[PDB]
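Standup notes
- HV: blocked on the assembly model, inputs below
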Amino acid sequence: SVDEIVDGVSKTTAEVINGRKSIAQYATSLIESNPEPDNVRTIISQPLIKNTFLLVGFGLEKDGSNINNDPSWNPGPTWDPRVRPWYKDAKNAGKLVITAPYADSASGEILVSVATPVKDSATGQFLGSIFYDVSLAELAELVNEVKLFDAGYVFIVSEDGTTIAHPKKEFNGKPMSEFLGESKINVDTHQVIINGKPYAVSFSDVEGEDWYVGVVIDEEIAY
Amino acid sequence: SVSDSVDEIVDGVSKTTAEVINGRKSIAQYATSLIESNPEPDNVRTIISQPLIKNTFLLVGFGLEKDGSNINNDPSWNPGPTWDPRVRPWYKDAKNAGKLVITAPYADSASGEILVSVATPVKDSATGQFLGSIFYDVSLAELAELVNEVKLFDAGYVFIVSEDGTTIAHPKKEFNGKPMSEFLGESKINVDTHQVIINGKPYAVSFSDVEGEDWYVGVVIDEE
Ligand SMILES: NC(=[NH2+])NCCC[C@H](N)C(=O)O
Ligand SMILES: NC(=[NH2+])NCCC[C@H](N)C(=O)O
């Protein structure tokens, strides 16, 4: 039953996503414990962090300076972290948040960031925000790793149908109607005609985020 | 074709199992790196007592070479001096390997349960002096549950063994640490899919090595 397949895929998706959240929150707590620049570098420049996220950086409220874990990239004349969506989202939320999809400053690629505020341990005053960049391509690939029927794919949307992750990276950050036709989420399994063929499409909410995972399966193989 | 099919099932479980074990390894390595960077007691306490660490492992402890003292992330565990971490298997394994390693199954000091531990040595950043070892306790029951959750075939189960057939994780906990011959009646690993008779009924059995360990995932599939 498709509902059972997509319900199982949402469980996995949550684990994938919650794993990234847990690591991001761990690094952020250790940083809050002692936000000395050298301790921040040590915390974010370990293999675990460099292998989980595309890039990690701490932007400072005081002066728009930043500490990050890729020496190859230093921000140009231009770049002020304080103007970036991950910065503001974490500051506004005052706790760990994941951004909507947006275009990365350097590459233009569509991504999301796990973002956390950093508060002064003593005062409680906002010092800045940390971003943990997440690859949507890798995300799509992960939630598509174990598939049961080998005739379709898994995707992730926000509640308004904005694509978070699709196997084809060209859909990331775009409305899901670009590959489903329909623009609003119909959670219940239903038939969608694509290219003249019938597919069963079904969604399941992702615990902890305002995302759904969706499934698109060729019916003649699906059943 | 049926042999190829079962082959693909154990391979799939092997891949997922490797991803999970490497993930836990990476987390232990990270923490060990942060501790090594600054092993002051309060910094160690701060590093190992976070939710990420308490949720990934059963228990985490840093035992010291100097006096056999320790810092662990379980506030209700306060072993007295008859618990010397320096004589424990995980401690010696970490010291011997000089890097991250996973133990063979052994009996836990407190519970007597058979578990394994991720183990890492810690060295003085400046002088290279050996300071002690950290253990990261892994539930074998939870491993058996993990590799059996995704089950494509009708009836049967999944298990883990070392290269010489020592059981790492079986759905039935009493087999943990035991030779696999106790539930397979074979003592040597035959990687290729092959028929095994167990209590009169035939089963398909097959193995796939786990990347990063000399472990194999095994499947026992009823041939109804
Ligand atoms: N790969 C990079 N160097 N990215 C730099 C930009 C960092 C962050 N994702 C932003 O857009 O603000
Ligand atoms: N749950 C516990 N308090 N275990 C204490 C023992 C720690 C470690 N597994 C050992 O046997 O040395």
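- HV (later): unblocked. Chain B has two domains: 1-26+140-224, 27-139. The pocket of arginine (ligand 1) is lined by residues A 55, 73, 84, 104-107, 113, 131, 133 (CB under 6 Å).
- Next: hand off to the docking folks.
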